[PDB]
């Protein structure tokens, strides 16, 4: 995607917030933006923490959430005004109430405008609300898994990606990443114990999408094969896109 160096961009740390909800999204020399989020069903609550790293107040501090056109239809975000004056060394919080209307690919933009020393300060960063946040894990027995796997009918509902590892292929980190992504992590389904299997339901207002995945590490080749099978083509695509970036 988007060409050129991802440093000083709107998305430097986005990928660190797909399989976890808490941490520092952005930090320049004036402002730190932290996150803490929780999701249930098709809903979420995201706390955004604005930290003034300086010894002077920020004035007219105004964070705004922007959702590009298709995103508008698929994601509803509700929030309340933040106090515009932020003391040096202080933090102010914003709470963002999230409702997923239907599956979606784009991310909202958080724009922050404030005055510091009489100067106009402007920051834009992509906010890590991603489709996998709306997962319900679904534990099930291996027989039930394979019966559902083999109900795929529409070829477009199956998406596979064979890709080079970007990170060390550590077993326990991999387990943690799948659990953080949000599906159940099913053991004793793939007879090869080195592979990972997941199952869950993506919840949206209008549609519930059942999802099955398989991750096959190839340690000597430093490669993975990821397979998504779900009840909606666009969900298989976005989940494969997201998960692939994590390994």
């Amino acid at each position: 995607g988007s060409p050129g160096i991802r440093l000083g961009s709107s998305e430097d740390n986005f990928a660190r917030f797909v399989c976890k909800n808490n941490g520092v999204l952005f930090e320049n020399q004036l402002l730190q933006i932290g996150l803490k989020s929780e999701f249930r069903q098709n809903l979420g609550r995201m706390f955004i923490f604005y930290g003034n790293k300086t010894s002077t107040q920020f004035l007219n501090f105004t964070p705004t959430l922007i959702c590009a056109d298709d995103l508008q239809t698929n994601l509803n975000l509700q929030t309340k005004p933040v106090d515009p004056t932020v003391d040096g060394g202080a933090q102010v919080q914003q709470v963002v109430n999230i409702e997923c209307i239907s599956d979606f690919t784009e991310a909202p933009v958080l724009n922050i405008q404030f005055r510091y020393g009489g100067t106009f300060q402007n920051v834009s960063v992509k906010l890590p609300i991603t489709l996998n946040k709306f997962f319900q894990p679904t534990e099930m027995a291996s027989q039930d898994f394979f019966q559902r796997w083999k109900q795929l009918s529409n070829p477009q509902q199956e998406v596979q990606n064979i890709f080079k590892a970007k990170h060390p292929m550590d077993t326990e980190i991999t387990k943690a990443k799948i659990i953080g992504f949000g599906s159940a992590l099913l053991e004793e389904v793939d007879p090869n114990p080195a592979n990972f299997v997941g199952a869950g339901i993506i919840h949206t207002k209008t549609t519930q999408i059942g999802c099955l995945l398989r991750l096959e590490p190839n340690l000597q080749a430093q490669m993975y094969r990821l397979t998504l099978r779900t009840s909606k083509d666009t969900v298989s695509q976005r989940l494969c896109e997201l998960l692939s970036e994590q390994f």
């Binding site: 793939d190 007879p191 398989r214």
Partner: peptide
């Protein structure tokens, strides 16, 4: 053999 076909 392979339950995934």
């Amino acid at each position: 053999s392979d339950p995934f076909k």
